[PDB]
Design an enzyme around this catalytic site. Structure first.
Site, PDB file in Angstrom:
ATOM      1  CB  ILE A 154       8.037 -32.945  61.730  1.00 11.98           C
ATOM      2  CG1 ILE A 154       7.591 -34.297  61.234  1.00 11.98           C
ATOM      3  CG2 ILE A 154       7.618 -32.782  63.153  1.00 11.98           C
ATOM      4  CD1 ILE A 154       8.482 -35.346  61.621  1.00 11.98           C
ATOM      5  N   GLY A 155       7.403 -32.082  58.494  1.00  9.00           N
ATOM      6  CA  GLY A 155       8.004 -32.092  57.183  1.00  9.00           C
ATOM      7  C   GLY A 155       7.046 -32.047  56.044  1.00  9.00           C
ATOM      8  CD  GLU A 156       5.236 -29.137  53.553  1.00 11.67           C
ATOM      9  OE1 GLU A 156       4.896 -29.796  54.561  1.00 11.67           O
ATOM     10  OE2 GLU A 156       5.082 -27.901  53.467  1.00 11.67           O
ATOM     11  N   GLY A 157       6.530 -33.874  52.584  1.00 12.61           N
ATOM     12  CA  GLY A 157       6.861 -35.123  51.932  1.00 12.61           C
ATOM     13  C   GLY A 157       6.463 -35.019  50.486  1.00 12.61           C
ATOM     14  CE1 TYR A 170       4.447 -40.656  50.801  1.00  7.45           C
ATOM     15  CE2 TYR A 170       5.639 -41.150  48.778  1.00  7.45           C
ATOM     16  CZ  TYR A 170       5.473 -41.304  50.150  1.00  7.45           C
ATOM     17  OH  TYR A 170       6.251 -42.107  50.934  1.00  7.45           O
ATOM     18  N   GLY A 171       2.606 -36.219  50.515  1.00  7.68           N
ATOM     19  CA  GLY A 171       1.868 -35.771  51.677  1.00  7.68           C
ATOM     20  C   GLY A 171       2.770 -35.280  52.774  1.00  7.68           C
ATOM     21  CD  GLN A 172       0.872 -30.942  55.218  1.00  7.96           C
ATOM     22  OE1 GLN A 172      -0.185 -31.481  55.572  1.00  7.96           O
ATOM     23  NE2 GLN A 172       0.939 -29.642  55.109  1.00  7.96           N
ATOM     24  CB  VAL A 173       6.464 -35.871  57.505  1.00  7.10           C
ATOM     25  CG1 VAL A 173       6.959 -36.835  58.551  1.00  7.10           C
ATOM     26  CG2 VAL A 173       6.817 -36.384  56.136  1.00  7.10           C
ATOM     27  CG  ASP A 203      16.415 -37.368  48.329  1.00  2.00           C
ATOM     28  OD1 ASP A 203      17.284 -36.474  48.113  1.00  2.00           O
ATOM     29  OD2 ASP A 203      15.248 -37.119  48.730  1.00  2.00           O
TER      30      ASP A 203
HETATM   31  C1  LIG Z   1      11.111 -41.130  58.789  1.00  6.94           C
HETATM   32  C2  LIG Z   1      10.043 -40.439  59.538  1.00  6.94           C
HETATM   33  N1  LIG Z   1      10.564 -39.729  60.693  1.00  6.94           N
HETATM   34  C3  LIG Z   1      10.592 -40.121  61.993  1.00  6.94           C
HETATM   35  N2  LIG Z   1      11.118 -39.242  62.806  1.00  6.94           N
HETATM   36  C4  LIG Z   1      11.455 -38.190  61.972  1.00  6.94           C
HETATM   37  C5  LIG Z   1      12.024 -36.934  62.201  1.00  6.94           C
HETATM   38  N3  LIG Z   1      12.458 -36.549  63.402  1.00  6.94           N
HETATM   39  C6  LIG Z   1      13.254 -35.371  63.597  1.00  6.94           C
HETATM   40  C7  LIG Z   1      12.404 -34.185  63.670  1.00  6.94           C
HETATM   41  N4  LIG Z   1      12.575 -33.162  62.812  1.00  6.94           N
HETATM   42  C8  LIG Z   1      11.610 -32.238  63.099  1.00  6.94           C
HETATM   43  C9  LIG Z   1      11.262 -31.012  62.565  1.00  6.94           C
HETATM   44  F1  LIG Z   1      11.950 -30.517  61.527  1.00  6.94           F
HETATM   45  C10 LIG Z   1      10.209 -30.308  63.082  1.00  6.94           C
HETATM   46  F2  LIG Z   1       9.866 -29.146  62.507  1.00  6.94           F
HETATM   47  C11 LIG Z   1       9.483 -30.789  64.135  1.00  6.94           C
HETATM   48  C12 LIG Z   1       9.821 -32.017  64.667  1.00  6.94           C
HETATM   49  C13 LIG Z   1      10.890 -32.740  64.138  1.00  6.94           C
HETATM   50  N5  LIG Z   1      11.402 -33.982  64.499  1.00  6.94           N
HETATM   51  N6  LIG Z   1      12.173 -36.096  61.174  1.00  6.94           N
HETATM   52  C14 LIG Z   1      11.782 -36.489  59.952  1.00  6.94           C
HETATM   53  N7  LIG Z   1      11.888 -35.543  58.940  1.00  6.94           N
HETATM   54  C15 LIG Z   1      12.732 -34.360  59.116  1.00  6.94           C
HETATM   55  C16 LIG Z   1      12.542 -33.329  58.028  1.00  6.94           C
HETATM   56  C17 LIG Z   1      11.196 -33.474  57.362  1.00  6.94           C
HETATM   57  C18 LIG Z   1      11.029 -34.854  56.736  1.00  6.94           C
HETATM   58  C19 LIG Z   1      11.652 -35.980  57.556  1.00  6.94           C
HETATM   59  C20 LIG Z   1      12.926 -36.537  56.936  1.00  6.94           C
HETATM   60  C21 LIG Z   1      12.946 -38.042  56.879  1.00  6.94           C
HETATM   61  O1  LIG Z   1      11.696 -38.542  56.495  1.00  6.94           O
HETATM   62  N8  LIG Z   1      11.260 -37.680  59.624  1.00  6.94           N
HETATM   63  C22 LIG Z   1      11.117 -38.477  60.674  1.00  6.94           C
HETATM   64 MG   LIG Z   2      12.720 -36.745  49.689  1.00  2.23          MG
END
Ligand SMILES: CCn1cnc2c(NCc3nc4c(F)c(F)ccc4[nH]3)nc(N3CCCC[C@H]3CCO)nc21
Ligand SMILES: [Mg+2]
Lengths: 240, 310
Positions: free
Chosen positions: B17-20, B22-25, B133
């Site tokens: 779902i994301g690029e972090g 220090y690692g992927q999300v 941020d």
């Molecule tokens: C804090 C950790 N955490 C818990 N739930 C979420 C979350 N839910 C929304 C969501 N977005 C998505 C997306 F884009 C996809 F492709 C696929 C699935 C998705 N679901 N989204 C993000 N991110 C959204 C952008 C990337 C990084 C982080 C930003 C904040 O850490 N972190 C989350």
């Molecule tokens: Mg950031």
């Protein structure tokens, strides 16, 4: 909420190292040695008292879960200092901790590090982090000794002497499992109490209640005198 | 309380779902509870300095924050090696929604989102943390209409008692305040409120209100709307490193109220105060909550918005 990081004396008699047959005196020695090694290495690296103490607290906690028979003390010490440096925003390169350790330890002591000393430390960091349960923030007695001594009103020279001596006692306490038994606020009061006793100072005379004997009750709640005495005895045992 | 020991294989990894930093999300599912979670990977291997000091800072901060409008880390898990920070999975983030073009936010939706964002921000600021941020992609929203301030990767402790020097290049450009563009290093929680004023404005226009590629260009765009920085509105501005170097094109008047006249008056007051150039005159997070726009927002009495179940 947060893990409990305090143990009984009965619990401290049953550490993983005693379970493996290390006698109590040897374990106390290993702890003193590990703590003094962190203190020595860190001092040479210009790290200050909070980083050294955090490194030492991680070290003592680590050995409530692991045995000295399985984990060589200086390797763990180096690893605890390394982590503490990052936690306390005073980072040091692992390379430099190794170099200082090589300089401070004899060949036998340094044998603990193996062929790749840096790798030995880095590999342990994962384990150390899991062991301390990612509970990185730690408070030490120093900050409380200072905060409490500041609220003292009296002869500046005696108060300064009380603090200087008390500070020395905190450094010593780090060699013992005192940080695994009592919160830093309590160790801070106990070192002031021990210093007052040795200096023959009447600390209650420096407070808003000169007639009130339990001068520490304005700093910490419901800490009996026998607790302060116990801590004192443990610190004094280092000098015996 | 026993963190770091549970294994990552207790989670089924659905997808990235994301690029972090220090690692992927990852989006994943708890095999025991069936609950959806987000996993933030922290890679250790082939790091010169081992477990990243960056993640250490984030972990220290996250563990001190418990608030309904702020991300709450459930546990830390390990590979059967990397670590994974575990969070409740949130259906959306503000950026994705705004970009989907599937959603329109009513004044009532905005009030609700802002009330929650500012309450989360205020909580952090009162705990002496600067977020550093704030941006749309870092604001999470659930289908229940619940908001969470996320990504404490750049957050740091701030000395409220006496001033200290901090890292100047923080905040993505579009949300970065004037004092930073001008080179301030002894800045305040006001930097985050500026970021939020940008979100507020963006909620109404659906487009980021300041879009430049470089710092000087960004200052000029800010100047065009908020007015040129100058002692008349910002006395201490002359003390900033790049004040003479980075100078807008003309000495612009503030036309914020004209540009955003389509916005409701009470929202516009708040926007005006949040996008005040002088950080010492910019409203605090506590002050936003006392504004006309937010002071009477009763969350319990608000209908959830119409968000896609995409
Ligand atoms: C804090 C950790 N955490 C818990 N739930 C979420 C979350 N839910 C929304 C969501 N977005 C998505 C997306 F884009 C996809 F492709 C696929 C699935 C998705 N679901 N989204 C993000 N991110 C959204 C952008 C990337 C990084 C982080 C930003 C904040 O850490 N972190 C989350
Ligand atoms: Mg950031």
């Amino acid at each position: 909420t947060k893990p409990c990081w305090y143990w009984d004396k009965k619990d401290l008699a049953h550490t993983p190292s005693q379970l493996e047959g290390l006698d109590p005196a040897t374990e106390a020695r290993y702890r003193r040695e590990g703590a003094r090694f962190i203190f020595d290495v860190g001092t040479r690296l210009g790290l200050h008292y909070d980083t050294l103490a955090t490194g030492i607290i991680y070290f003592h906690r680590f050995y409530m879960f692991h045995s000295f028979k399985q984990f060589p003390r200086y390797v763990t010490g180096a690893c605890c200092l390394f982590l503490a440096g990052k936690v306390e925003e005073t980072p040091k390169k692992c390379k430099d901790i190794i170099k200082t350790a090589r300089s401070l330890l004899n060949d036998v002591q340094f044998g603990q590090f193996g062929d790749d000393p840096k790798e030995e430390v880095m590999v342990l960091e994962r384990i150390l982090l899991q062991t301390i349960k990612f509970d990185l923030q730690v408070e030490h007695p120093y900050q409380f000794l200072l905060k409490y001594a500041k609220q003292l009103k009296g002869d500046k020279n005696k108060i300064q002497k009380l603090v200087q001596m008390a500070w020395t006692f905190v450094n010593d306490s780090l060699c013992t499992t005192l940080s695994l038994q009592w919160e830093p606020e309590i160790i801070a009061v106990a070192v002031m109490y021990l210093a007052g006793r040795l200096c023959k100072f009447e600390i209650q005379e420096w407070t808003s209640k000169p007639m009130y004997r339990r001068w520490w009750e304005q700093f910490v709640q419901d800490v009996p005198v026998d607790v302060l005495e116990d801590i004192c005895h443990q610190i004094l045992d280092l000098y015996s | 309380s026993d963190w770091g020991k549970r294994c990552v294989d207790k989670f089924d990894i659905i997808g990235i779902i994301g690029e972090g930093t220090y690692g992927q999300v990852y989006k994943a599912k708890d095999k025991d509870t069936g609950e959806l979670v987000a996993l933030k990977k922290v890679r250790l291997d082939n790091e010169k300095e081992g477990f990243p000091i960056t993640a250490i800072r984030e972990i220290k901060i996250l563990r001190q924050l418990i608030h309904r409008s702020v991300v709450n880390m459930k546990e830390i898990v390990t590979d059967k090696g990397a670590f994974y920070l575990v969070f409740e999975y949130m259906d959306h983030d503000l950026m994705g929604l705004l970009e989907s073009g599937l959603v329109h936010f009513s004044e009532d939706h905005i009030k609700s989102f802002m009330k929650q964002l500012m309450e989360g921000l205020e909580y952090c600021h009162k705990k002496n943390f600067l977020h550093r941020d704030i941006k749309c992609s870092n604001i999470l929203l659930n289908n229940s209409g619940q908001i969470k301030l996320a990504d404490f990767g750049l957050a740091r402790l701030y000395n409220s008692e006496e001033s200290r020097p901090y890292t100047n290049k923080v905040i993505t450009l579009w949300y970065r305040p004037p004092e930073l563009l001008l080179g301030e290093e002894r800045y305040t929680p006001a930097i985050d409120v500026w970021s939020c004023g940008c979100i507020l404005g963006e909620l109404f226009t659906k487009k980021p209100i300041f879009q430049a590629n470089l710092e000087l260009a960004q200052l000029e765009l800010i100047s065009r709307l908020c007015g040129s920085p100058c002692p008349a509105v910002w006395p201490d501005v002359i003390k900033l490193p790049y004040f003479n170097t980075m100078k807008p094109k003309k000495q612009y008047r503030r036309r914020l109220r004209e540009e955003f006249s389509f916005i409701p008056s009470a929202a516009l007051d708040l926007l005006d105060h949040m996008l005040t150039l002088d950080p010492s005159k910019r409203c605090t997070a506590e002050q936003t909550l006392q504004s006309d726009f937010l002071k009477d927002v009763e969350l319990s009495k608000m209908a959830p918005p119409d968000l896609p179940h995409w």
